Scaffold this motif. Structure first.
Motif, PDB file in Angstrom:
ATOM      1  N   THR A  38       0.842  -1.208   0.000  1.00  0.00           N
ATOM      2  CA  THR A  38       0.000   0.000   0.000  1.00  0.00           C
ATOM      3  C   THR A  38       0.867   1.245   0.000  1.00  0.00           C
ATOM      4  O   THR A  38       1.740   1.376   0.855  1.00  0.00           O
ATOM      5  CB  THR A  38      -0.940   0.054   1.207  1.00  0.00           C
ATOM      6  OG1 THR A  38      -1.754  -1.124   1.193  1.00  0.00           O
ATOM      7  CG2 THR A  38      -1.872   1.249   1.110  1.00  0.00           C
ATOM      8  N   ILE A  39       0.595   2.094  -0.982  1.00  0.00           N
ATOM      9  CA  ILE A  39       1.327   3.343  -1.115  1.00  0.00           C
ATOM     10  C   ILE A  39       0.368   4.490  -0.836  1.00  0.00           C
ATOM     11  O   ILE A  39      -0.843   4.391  -0.940  1.00  0.00           O
ATOM     12  CB  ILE A  39       1.994   3.513  -2.475  1.00  0.00           C
ATOM     13  CG1 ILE A  39       1.037   3.584  -3.679  1.00  0.00           C
ATOM     14  CG2 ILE A  39       3.010   2.391  -2.696  1.00  0.00           C
ATOM     15  CD1 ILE A  39       1.721   4.022  -4.943  1.00  0.00           C
ATOM     16  N   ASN A  40       1.001   5.576  -0.459  1.00  0.00           N
ATOM     17  CA  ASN A  40       0.342   6.845  -0.307  1.00  0.00           C
ATOM     18  C   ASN A  40       0.813   7.810  -1.399  1.00  0.00           C
ATOM     19  O   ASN A  40       2.009   7.984  -1.641  1.00  0.00           O
ATOM     20  CB  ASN A  40       0.587   7.488   1.072  1.00  0.00           C
ATOM     21  CG  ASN A  40      -0.219   6.656   2.079  1.00  0.00           C
ATOM     22  OD1 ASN A  40      -1.416   6.868   2.249  1.00  0.00           O
ATOM     23  ND2 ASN A  40       0.440   5.690   2.703  1.00  0.00           N
ATOM     24  N   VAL A  41      -0.174   8.404  -2.029  1.00  0.00           N
ATOM     25  CA  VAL A  41      -0.014   9.292  -3.177  1.00  0.00           C
ATOM     26  C   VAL A  41      -0.572  10.654  -2.761  1.00  0.00           C
ATOM     27  O   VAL A  41      -1.701  10.679  -2.258  1.00  0.00           O
ATOM     28  CB  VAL A  41      -0.728   8.716  -4.384  1.00  0.00           C
ATOM     29  CG1 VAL A  41      -0.856   9.701  -5.539  1.00  0.00           C
ATOM     30  CG2 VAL A  41       0.044   7.474  -4.815  1.00  0.00           C
ATOM     31  N   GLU A  42       0.220  11.693  -2.921  1.00  0.00           N
ATOM     32  CA  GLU A  42      -0.194  13.023  -2.490  1.00  0.00           C
ATOM     33  C   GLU A  42      -1.435  13.484  -3.255  1.00  0.00           C
ATOM     34  O   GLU A  42      -1.480  13.357  -4.481  1.00  0.00           O
ATOM     35  CB  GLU A  42       0.929  14.059  -2.621  1.00  0.00           C
ATOM     36  CG  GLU A  42       0.470  15.387  -2.020  1.00  0.00           C
ATOM     37  CD  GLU A  42       1.529  16.469  -2.016  1.00  0.00           C
ATOM     38  OE1 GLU A  42       2.192  16.648  -3.065  1.00  0.00           O
ATOM     39  OE2 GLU A  42       1.674  17.138  -0.957  1.00  0.00           O
ATOM     40  N   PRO A  43      -2.401  14.022  -2.510  1.00  0.00           N
ATOM     41  CA  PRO A  43      -3.532  14.713  -3.135  1.00  0.00           C
ATOM     42  C   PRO A  43      -2.967  15.690  -4.167  1.00  0.00           C
ATOM     43  O   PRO A  43      -1.902  16.285  -4.016  1.00  0.00           O
ATOM     44  CB  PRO A  43      -4.217  15.463  -2.001  1.00  0.00           C
ATOM     45  CG  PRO A  43      -3.862  14.653  -0.800  1.00  0.00           C
ATOM     46  CD  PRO A  43      -2.489  14.101  -1.056  1.00  0.00           C
ATOM     47  N   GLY A  44      -3.727  15.767  -5.233  1.00  0.00           N
ATOM     48  CA  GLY A  44      -3.500  16.708  -6.306  1.00  0.00           C
ATOM     49  C   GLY A  44      -2.532  16.128  -7.297  1.00  0.00           C
ATOM     50  O   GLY A  44      -2.131  16.758  -8.266  1.00  0.00           O
ATOM     51  N   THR A  45      -2.110  14.882  -7.034  1.00  0.00           N
ATOM     52  CA  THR A  45      -1.197  14.323  -8.016  1.00  0.00           C
ATOM     53  C   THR A  45      -1.804  14.223  -9.408  1.00  0.00           C
ATOM     54  O   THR A  45      -2.884  13.693  -9.655  1.00  0.00           O
ATOM     55  CB  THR A  45      -0.738  12.918  -7.586  1.00  0.00           C
ATOM     56  OG1 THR A  45       0.230  13.059  -6.547  1.00  0.00           O
ATOM     57  CG2 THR A  45      -0.026  12.259  -8.750  1.00  0.00           C
ATOM     58  N   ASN A  46      -1.024  14.752 -10.358  1.00  0.00           N
ATOM     59  CA  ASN A  46      -1.516  14.805 -11.726  1.00  0.00           C
ATOM     60  C   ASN A  46      -0.623  13.966 -12.628  1.00  0.00           C
ATOM     61  O   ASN A  46       0.598  14.043 -12.551  1.00  0.00           O
ATOM     62  CB  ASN A  46      -1.545  16.254 -12.222  1.00  0.00           C
ATOM     63  CG  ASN A  46      -2.258  16.379 -13.555  1.00  0.00           C
ATOM     64  OD1 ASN A  46      -3.482  16.322 -13.597  1.00  0.00           O
ATOM     65  ND2 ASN A  46      -1.504  16.534 -14.632  1.00  0.00           N
ATOM     66  N   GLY A  47      -1.264  13.159 -13.470  1.00  0.00           N
ATOM     67  CA  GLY A  47      -0.495  12.315 -14.348  1.00  0.00           C
ATOM     68  C   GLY A  47       0.308  11.241 -13.659  1.00  0.00           C
ATOM     69  O   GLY A  47       1.421  10.939 -14.081  1.00  0.00           O
ATOM     70  N   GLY A  48      -0.220  10.625 -12.609  1.00  0.00           N
ATOM     71  CA  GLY A  48       0.429   9.493 -11.982  1.00  0.00           C
ATOM     72  C   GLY A  48       0.128   8.211 -12.745  1.00  0.00           C
ATOM     73  O   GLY A  48      -0.881   8.138 -13.443  1.00  0.00           O
ATOM     74  N   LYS A  49       1.067   7.282 -12.638  1.00  0.00           N
ATOM     75  CA  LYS A  49       0.918   5.958 -13.214  1.00  0.00           C
ATOM     76  C   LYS A  49       1.458   4.885 -12.264  1.00  0.00           C
ATOM     77  O   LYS A  49       2.456   5.062 -11.588  1.00  0.00           O
ATOM     78  CB  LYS A  49       1.628   5.837 -14.557  1.00  0.00           C
ATOM     79  CG  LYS A  49       1.186   6.876 -15.564  1.00  0.00           C
ATOM     80  CD  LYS A  49       1.939   6.719 -16.864  1.00  0.00           C
ATOM     81  CE  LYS A  49       1.800   7.878 -17.795  1.00  0.00           C
ATOM     82  NZ  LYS A  49       0.433   8.365 -18.046  1.00  0.00           N
ATOM     83  N   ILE A  50       0.737   3.769 -12.305  1.00  0.00           N
ATOM     84  CA  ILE A  50       1.218   2.541 -11.686  1.00  0.00           C
ATOM     85  C   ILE A  50       1.286   1.450 -12.735  1.00  0.00           C
ATOM     86  O   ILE A  50       0.438   1.324 -13.626  1.00  0.00           O
ATOM     87  CB  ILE A  50       0.291   2.182 -10.524  1.00  0.00           C
ATOM     88  CG1 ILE A  50       0.400   3.178  -9.358  1.00  0.00           C
ATOM     89  CG2 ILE A  50       0.515   0.729 -10.112  1.00  0.00           C
ATOM     90  CD1 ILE A  50      -0.791   3.163  -8.414  1.00  0.00           C
ATOM     91  N   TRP A  51       2.357   0.663 -12.624  1.00  0.00           N
ATOM     92  CA  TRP A  51       2.459  -0.426 -13.596  1.00  0.00           C
ATOM     93  C   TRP A  51       3.222  -1.582 -12.948  1.00  0.00           C
ATOM     94  O   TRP A  51       3.828  -1.416 -11.889  1.00  0.00           O
ATOM     95  CB  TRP A  51       3.113   0.032 -14.882  1.00  0.00           C
ATOM     96  CG  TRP A  51       4.542   0.476 -14.835  1.00  0.00           C
ATOM     97  CD1 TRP A  51       5.632  -0.229 -15.222  1.00  0.00           C
ATOM     98  CD2 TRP A  51       5.047   1.732 -14.368  1.00  0.00           C
ATOM     99  NE1 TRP A  51       6.780   0.488 -15.034  1.00  0.00           N
ATOM    100  CE2 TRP A  51       6.440   1.701 -14.508  1.00  0.00           C
ATOM    101  CE3 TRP A  51       4.420   2.871 -13.837  1.00  0.00           C
ATOM    102  CZ2 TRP A  51       7.247   2.773 -14.144  1.00  0.00           C
ATOM    103  CZ3 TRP A  51       5.226   3.938 -13.478  1.00  0.00           C
ATOM    104  CH2 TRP A  51       6.618   3.872 -13.638  1.00  0.00           C
ATOM    105  N   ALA A  52       3.165  -2.729 -13.598  1.00  0.00           N
ATOM    106  CA  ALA A  52       3.970  -3.883 -13.230  1.00  0.00           C
ATOM    107  C   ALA A  52       5.210  -3.955 -14.114  1.00  0.00           C
ATOM    108  O   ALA A  52       5.179  -3.625 -15.283  1.00  0.00           O
ATOM    109  CB  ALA A  52       3.166  -5.159 -13.348  1.00  0.00           C
TER     110      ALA A  52
END
Ligand SMILES: [K+]
Ligand SMILES: [K+]
Ligand SMILES: [K+]
Ligand SMILES: [K+]
Length: 206
Positions: A38-52
């Motif tokens: 489990t990760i925490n991503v800052e509010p307002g993050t724009n253009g985030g991606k997660i991948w394998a």
């Protein structure tokens, strides 16, 4: 925002999280089959991606290589990954809402579900066997199913001008996965979620 990243694949993956100019959270971690991160991503993050990423080797220092989605040979990605990469894409707290999608524009390596864990919107999924059914000319020797822009580097596949239509190749992706972007100007499959939703990305959901 929390993202639970869950590897349901029978094989190890190295999860990666970036907004292209920086890591999200630690930016990458190994997930053995069944593991959750489990990760925490800052509010307002724009253009985030997660991948394998698949078939990775890292040293001591967190440096090495992967055969799909390598991010400059880091365990802990600060930049986006080398195609082919199935992409969970999100922009958070954009005028009150969150926007999520899955994209095959950078190809496909691992099937994925990307769903809220909180109320008020649907998930999206691309879990068809795109690598098995991959057109021959898109197969990556390294592993996975490349997108056509990656393979052929044309204005039409890459939509360089911002002028492009669907293609025989994009339609393959779209056929297998209607709910994922198949090319740059695809009819959007982006889901609007409440601002500050929380999420789960599941690799090999089925
Ligand atoms: K509701
Ligand atoms: K879903
Ligand atoms: K199609
Ligand atoms: K769009």
């Amino acid at each position: 925002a929390t993202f639970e990243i869950v590897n349901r694949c029978s094989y190890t993956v190295w999860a990666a999280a970036s907004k292209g100019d920086a890591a999200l959270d630690a930016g990458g971690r190994q997930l053995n089959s069944g593991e959750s991160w489990t990760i925490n991503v800052e509010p307002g993050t724009n253009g985030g991606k997660i991948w394998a990423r698949t078939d990775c080797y890292f040293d001591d220092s967190g440096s090495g290589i992967c055969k799909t989605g390598d991010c400059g040979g880091l365990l802990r990605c600060k930049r986006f990954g080398r195609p082919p990469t199935t992409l969970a894409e999100f922009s958070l707290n954009q005028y009150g809402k969150d926007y999520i999608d899955i994209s095959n524009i950078k190809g496909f390596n691992v099937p994925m579900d990307f769903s809220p864990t909180t109320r008020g919107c649907r998930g999206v999924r691309c879990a068809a066997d795109i690598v098995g059914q991959c057109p021959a000319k898109l197969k990556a020797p390294g592993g996975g199913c490349n997108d056509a822009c990656t393979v052929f580097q044309t204005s039409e596949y890459c939509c360089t001008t911002g002028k492009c239509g669907p293609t025989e190749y994009s339609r393959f992706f779209k056929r297998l996965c209607p709910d994922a972007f198949s090319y740059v100007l695809d009819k959007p499959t982006t889901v609007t979620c409440p601002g500050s939703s929380n999420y789960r990305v599941t690799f090999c959901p089925t």
